[PDB]
Amino acid sequence: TSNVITQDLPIPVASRGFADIVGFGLDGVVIGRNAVNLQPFLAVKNFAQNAGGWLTTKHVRLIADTTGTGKGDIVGFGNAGVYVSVNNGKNTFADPPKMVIANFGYDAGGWRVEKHLRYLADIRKTGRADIIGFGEKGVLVSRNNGGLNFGPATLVLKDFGYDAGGWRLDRHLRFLADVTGNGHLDIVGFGDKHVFISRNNGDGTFAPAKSVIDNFCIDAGGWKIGDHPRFVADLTGDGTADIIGCGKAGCWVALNNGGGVFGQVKLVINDFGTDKGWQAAKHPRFIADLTGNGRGDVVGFGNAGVYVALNNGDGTFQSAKLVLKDFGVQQGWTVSKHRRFVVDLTGDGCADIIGFGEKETLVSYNDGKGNFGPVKALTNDFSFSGGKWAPETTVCWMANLDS
Amino acid sequence: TSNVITQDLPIPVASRGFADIVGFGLDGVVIGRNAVNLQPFLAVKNFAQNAGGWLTTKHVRLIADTTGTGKGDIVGFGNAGVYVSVNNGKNTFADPPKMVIANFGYDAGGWRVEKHLRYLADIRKTGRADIIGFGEKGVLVSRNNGGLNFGPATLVLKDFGYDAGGWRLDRHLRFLADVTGNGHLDIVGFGDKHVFISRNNGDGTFAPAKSVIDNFCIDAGGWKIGDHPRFVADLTGDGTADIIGCGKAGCWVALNNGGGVFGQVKLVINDFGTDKGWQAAKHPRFIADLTGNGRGDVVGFGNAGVYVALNNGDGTFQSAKLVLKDFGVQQGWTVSKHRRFVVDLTGDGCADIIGFGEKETLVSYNDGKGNFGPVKALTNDFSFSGGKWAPETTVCWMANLDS
């Protein structure tokens, strides 16, 4: 297992735990705490389409531990800066939220959802999240200095930026993961001709970017943003992030030697790629630990239902098989209306499947071996419900509120 | 609300949160973590009747944060000493447990469930639990030095002991609670003729026992152990512990002024006592916050069902009333086979009711005002299921594993 931050999944969820639902609904933040009587709780009247004027087109809304308590706080990147609603521990969130910094906003620093990435991460391993943004001139970091005091937004690396040199959301990928093996989150960038790494030194600095693979990129191997999803994830159990991507012929991986050196790029699964009919607009794919061994498995929501290929434990894989006859295109699930997640809901380290459907939120539980039980109606809440949870106007995440 | 440790409830549960089931079953520690798919998880194959030789008549089995991570660990006072299974933060408990001190055991120091009390509490307020024992010659403490290092068991107070002077379980009550107002757990002892306090200094030392109330005792008002239950809880909202006892004619309180000095003993509820049929063998009673206002309310499981009296906020009460035709004698609930709990399961700060019955574990949710909804079968697990969960051979607590 590696803790990892991607563009699609900026909020790390524990591989072994009881994931909670956090929804930025139309009228505010709705918490669905993983519990015996799941009931949506309107925790904060803000951070919402119809409370505070929050927009998916202009703002970023996340969950992270900004105080160091181990409790996840609500964080919003608004117009004038970053606002935080502190989780008081005992199921209460501060409302109204407090503005902790005049940077990383639409009006503060000219940040744009179309050009930049903003993440929250404990890059210094101090137990609370720094602000890290992939901006114009490079990677800007504001150190979290306790008590919601954030250091100056500081250009810490002149690379991986819209204007340093030429990073684009329609061409490239920028993730954070420990690939060097020092416990700290590094920068992993899929550029034009190479995957680049910038090592996190440990002390709030990143080394200059270095090329590590001549593949997985738009102009090295023909990897395209829509059609060929790429991931970073521990596939060997050594605790460092390997690389895997769903391409044309199937899934290709390059394994980390444990220090950020990558081996040859090999086809490990002849499925999940375009040759077998997997399309970005229809078929969400994920890497998640479905067997509790700390190694990433491949999960895909295909046409007839969900397909999985299990990791043998060493970065090679078994064949893909259909494991669950639901949550697929045949059953009516769509990327534009519905939300699907692959996360542990039950504390056994084997990821379960939950889907926010048209009118119902459904779940199927992993059996502890990578197989799935009968689908069950968990709640009417969080479902699309004719627009109540439209992707255009709401954001939903799984997160461990108690981490 | 005040943090309180009692003989019947040695483990404090949060008044606002999602309490977890922790059961010491026949085959090991079973965690019933409060979650969407509640299932017994055999976490440690020890601490059990048929795993490690653990017995209700010989050993003490608890949950407490021994490491300071905010996560409850499994702790057992066994034969040769105290054993801990650390909770790693990812629903994993060390197995086998490791011994942390060769004392406070049946063989090590001659501790007896029939004679002595053993608690775990953060009496120094450093984020982790010291061991506190009421033994033969007085109060013995072992300082939790971190990393599971425990200091020598030290006789810190020559009072409250089986042989200093004659404290007996058939007769007296010994609790930990903050009654001085200094934020630290004090010793509260219902002796022969007085309620005694021993103030907690801070350094984890206690001042000589001082008489504070001439009442609530076997020789001061005729208070008997089973028949006339006494509790300590915050009934005023100030964070200091008040005192309430269910006498013959109803509930008498003595209110804390906030500095550990008590007002006149007065009758505030005309029910819950032997006069109105309440009996030690049949009708367990509790103080719990049913309204979320931080003041303790009175709950009793009677004949026809559950009765409550709601605190006005200041230690005076509305009249008692039956809120639920269930969990009572007439529905077949007995103290000898079944377990009943009054704890928040839903994080709204209003305590709910859960019961481990004959073949089923049932729940009724507080509506948020002290009323209760229909009883729902939660799971078949943790139920007597003769006699998988016999009280003679197993132990079940509610606890918040994630503080």
Residue numbers in the entry:
A (entry chain A), B (entry chain B): 2 to 404
Can you provide the manuscript's text about this entry?
In this paper, we report the crystal structures of a lectin from Agrocybe aegerita, designated as AAL2, in its apo- and complex forms with GlcNAc and GlcNAcβ1-3Galβ1-4GlcNAc, as part of our endeavors to develop a system to facilitate the identification and purification of O-GlcNAcylated proteins. AAL2 was recently discovered from the fruit body of the edible mushroom A. aegerita. AAL2 was found to specifically bind nonreducing terminal N-acetylglucosamine (GlcNAc) moieties of either alpha- or beta-linkage and was reported to have the activity of inducing apoptosis in hepatoma cells in vitro as well as inhibiting hepatoma growth in tumour-bearing mice in vivo. The overall structure of AAL2 monomer is a single domain with the shape of cylindrical torus with a diameter of about 51Å and a height of about 27Å, showing a very regular, seven-bladed β-propeller fold formed by the blades packing in a circular array.
The structures of AAL2, AAL2-GlcNAc and AAL2-GlcNAcβ1-3Galβ1-4GlcNAc were determined at resolutions of 2.0Å, 2.1Å, and 2.0Å, respectively. There are two virtually identical AAL2 monomers arranged around a two-fold pseudoaxis of symmetry in an asymmetric unit in both the structures of AAL2 and AAL2-GlcNAc, and one AAL2 monomer in AAL2-GlcNAcβ1-3Galβ1-4GlcNAc, while the protein exists as monomers in solution as determined from its elution volume on a Superdex 200 10/300 GL column. As expected from the sequence homology, the structures of AAL2 and AAL2-GlcNAc complex are very similar to those of the corresponding structures of PVL, with root-mean-square deviations (RMSDs) of 0.7Å for Cα atoms. Each blade is a β-sheet consisting of four anti-parallel β-strands arranged in a W-like shape and of about 56 residues in length, and is named W-motif according to its shape. Seven tandem W-motifs of the AAL2 monomer, numbered WI to WVII from N- to C-terminus, are organized around a seven-fold axis of pseudo symmetry. The first β-strands of the seven W-motifs are located innermost of the AAL2 monomer and form a central tunnel that is filled with water molecules and almost blocked by a long N-terminus loop (except for a small opening). These 7 innermost strands point to the same direction, from the ‘entrance’ to the ‘exit’ of the central tunnel, and run almost parallel to each other along the direction of the seven-fold propeller axis. What is notable is that the seven sequence repeats observed in AAL2 do not match exactly with the seven blades, but instead have a shifting of one β-strand. WI consists of three consecutive strands, i.e., strands 2, 3 and 4 at the N-terminus, and one strand, i.e., strand 1, from the C-terminus.
